[PDB]
């Protein structure tokens, strides 16, 4: 539960760091954002579940 | 202080506040890269 | 050839770092008050 929480919360940080540097260069070079429109979508969708994971999961650790 | 669990992020949260300033800064990194058009 | 805009943003952060070290030194050094 705890490590499980620190995983979700900690991974959620690296995804953000990755997501943050990503989306930019994404819409940036139109070399796609059609193939990456796929990547970004998964990052975005993923992120939300994560927040919800850490959200609900918070009430069990603290 | 930060709820017991998140304590591991104490240090992280220590720098968050200053970020906004960075953006005003970046805008300059950019223009420089794009040769002040 | 090293792109100018990089020479700057690098030499730049480099100064905020040293000048920032000075500001930290103000709450620890001899110039402290403690």
């Amino acid at each position: 539960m705890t490590i499980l929480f620190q995983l979700a919360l900690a991974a959620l940080v690296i995804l953000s760091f990755v997501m943050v540097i990503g989306v930019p260069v994404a819409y940036a070079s139109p070399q796609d954002w059609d193939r990456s429109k796929q990547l970004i979508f998964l990052g975005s969708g993923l992120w939300i579940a994560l927040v919800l994971v850490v959200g609900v999961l918070n009430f069990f650790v603290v | 202080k930060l709820p017991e669990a998140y304590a591991i992020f104490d240090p992280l949260v220590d720098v968050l506040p200053v970020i906004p300033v960075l953006f005003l800064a970046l805008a300059f990194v950019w223009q420089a890269a794009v040769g002040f058009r | 050839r090293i792109p100018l805009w990089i020479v700057a943003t690098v030499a730049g952060m480099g100064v905020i770092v040293i000048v920032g070290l000075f500001f930290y030194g103000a709450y620890a050094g001899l110039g402290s008050s403690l």
């Binding site: 940036a28 070079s29 | 220590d14 960075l22 990194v29 890269a33 | -």
Partner: peptide
């Protein structure tokens, strides 16, 4: 102790997300 580790990365991040664009040359 030394969360300067943090700053550092999120710091070279700003210039990075434009540099990679200087490489993939486009939209600056």
């Amino acid at each position: 102790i030394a969360q300067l580790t943090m700053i550092a990365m999120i710091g070279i991040a700003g210039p990075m997300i434009i540099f990679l664009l200087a490489v993939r040359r486009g939209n600056l």
